[PDB]
Design a binder for this molecule. Sequence first.
Ligand SMILES: Cc1cc2nc3c(=O)[nH]c(=O)nc-3n(C[C@H](O)[C@H](O)[C@H](O)COP(=O)(O)OP(=O)(O)OC[C@H]3O[C@@H](n4cnc5c(N)ncnc54)[C@H](O)[C@@H]3O)c2cc1C
Ligand SMILES: Cc1cc2nc3c(=O)[nH]c(=O)nc-3n(C[C@H](O)[C@H](O)[C@H](O)COP(=O)(O)OP(=O)(O)OC[C@H]3O[C@@H](n4cnc5c(N)ncnc54)[C@H](O)[C@@H]3O)c2cc1C
Lengths: 273, 276
Amino acid sequence: MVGRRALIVLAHSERTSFNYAMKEAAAAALKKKGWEVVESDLYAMNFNPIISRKDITGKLKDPANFQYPAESVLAYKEGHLSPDIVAEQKKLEAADLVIFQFPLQWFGVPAILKGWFERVFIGEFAYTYAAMYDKGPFRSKKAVLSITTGGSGSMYSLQGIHGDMNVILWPIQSGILHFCGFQVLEPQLTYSIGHTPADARIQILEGWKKRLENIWDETPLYFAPSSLFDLNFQAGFLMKKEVQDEEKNKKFGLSVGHHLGKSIPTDNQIKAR
Amino acid sequence: GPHMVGRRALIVLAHSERTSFNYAMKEAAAAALKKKGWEVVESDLYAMNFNPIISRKDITGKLKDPANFQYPAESVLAYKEGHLSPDIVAEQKKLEAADLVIFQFPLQWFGVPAILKGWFERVFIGEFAYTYAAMYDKGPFRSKKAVLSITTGGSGSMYSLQGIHGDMNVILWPIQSGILHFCGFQVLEPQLTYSIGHTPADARIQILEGWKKRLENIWDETPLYFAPSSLFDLNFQAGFLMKKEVQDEEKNKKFGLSVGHHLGKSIPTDNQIKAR
Ligand SMILES: Cc1cc2nc3c(=O)[nH]c(=O)nc-3n(C[C@H](O)[C@H](O)[C@H](O)COP(=O)(O)OP(=O)(O)OC[C@H]3O[C@@H](n4cnc5c(N)ncnc54)[C@H](O)[C@@H]3O)c2cc1C
Ligand SMILES: Cc1cc2nc3c(=O)[nH]c(=O)nc-3n(C[C@H](O)[C@H](O)[C@H](O)COP(=O)(O)OP(=O)(O)OC[C@H]3O[C@@H](n4cnc5c(N)ncnc54)[C@H](O)[C@@H]3O)c2cc1C
């Protein structure tokens, strides 16, 4: 009910960027509230984002038919993961709150951050088909995305040329974060930061600092509870028969991905209900 | 269907293993197109040991503003001056030549592998791949066709409307619309190979044969539906919003236009998976 440890993952090469200023603003605001703040500035760490056989520090189980998921899980169980992955996994294990600070790039996370998820979020460590989504290993943790874009807010509105931002956010927030157990908080969306005058930029930094004063007390984003599904291969991980019947009486879909051919609830991936 | 002899294909592969089904699919695609007279070029990102990280090392000469580095403006300027790193230039020349672009990858964390995401970031430079002046429909790759050939760990049912992962059409949207279509590409129906780890040996053989059979007449296919850019007022003053007349015509519709342009309505079935 009180958050004490935070991890800030930053994905920007420039110490001069607004992204770096947002990482500094976050670290300062949380430290003032008594949090222990740990950082993963991917570029300053020269983080290797590419999965490979070298992520296993020893012999492989089946090198003739190398399969990264089974091999990396085995290396995790045996303590044979590459020390750079182990150090990141320790940061995650200690954190209550995880902040991801990054510029939106090609409607997703920068490649360096994509590879950080790929090499760090190893099976059993971060996810398991035995405890999916709300039952996941990171269920006691909270995650938040703080994103800057080149495009304006209107471009990402329902009627905007790029389409709904809620759709762009879904694969990261549900698929990457929520699948691992994280309760996902409302994203900090900083639109067209390149076309924002100096006065407003100072205020964006202060607004983010003020939000972080009570971040742990916020209501997280709504995702469909895992209890609504038959979480086993035989049923095909499909929504329960009774839930399918009950949902026929629902006007809106449960979320973006669980729209069910119905209207998506307004800002399902942007605002808590 | 119509002959494509001498036409050009680029296969971008994102898998390190020669023994992978992804590599098998790349080989099947190259053999099928070559049999139809296509000129086939590949970008095996792991074999190339492709640098996937955007940095100032992507520009060879002097920068416009080295104390305040901004990748978009610096990379565009480098493209205009022909000062992009040679590895980027070699990939941009492969794309320029290609009529058809196949992206062969295993689905990783509900998107493209980091190496392929890095390829998009370093290769798809402004002016070369996109402009705010000619977004989406009018984009530089409007004469080209792109196709995703994806393999997944999860079954088809996990990615169905009622599946635990949610609708696959939503996962596909940021790649197909945001990356490919924004650049002008006509996007073809994705080749989706679900739970390839659970597929029996005879079924895996027939997935390869089915892919080869599809590539025999791929250029003749109807592309996926995206809302035309002509429905929007493409400028800052209008905020790149749908035209008033389009908004009025949409009020009594039950269905939205696409995944991204769902407009608070019902998404048409398989908008990112099946063409109309
Ligand atoms: C590969 C690539 C792909 C992209 N794809 C997309 C896409 O899909 N969608 C999209 O919308 N955009 C896209 N973009 C644009 C991108 O999201 C923006 O360029 C980015 O968000 C800008 O954020 P920044 O941190 O780099 O800011 P900067 O450009 O570095 O900074 C913005 C301003 O803030 C100022 N600033 C810095 N520090 C401070 C401080 N302490 N206090 C106040 N002001 C400060 C700077 O001086 C500058 O004036 C893409 C960019 C790249 C490189
Ligand atoms: C970091 C990471 C994240 C992931 N995230 C996700 C996710 O978000 N969603 C998801 O659903 N999955 C996810 N996965 C799973 C991933 O999509 C699968 O592991 C992958 O698609 C398997 O395809 P492959 O090419 O590696 O095949 P392999 O596992 O290498 O092989 C599959 C089968 O094909 C056989 N085969 C190979 N060549 C031939 C041939 N010529 N003819 C016939 N059979 C052949 C093999 O022997 C094997 O039986 C993730 C995996 C990783 C590494």
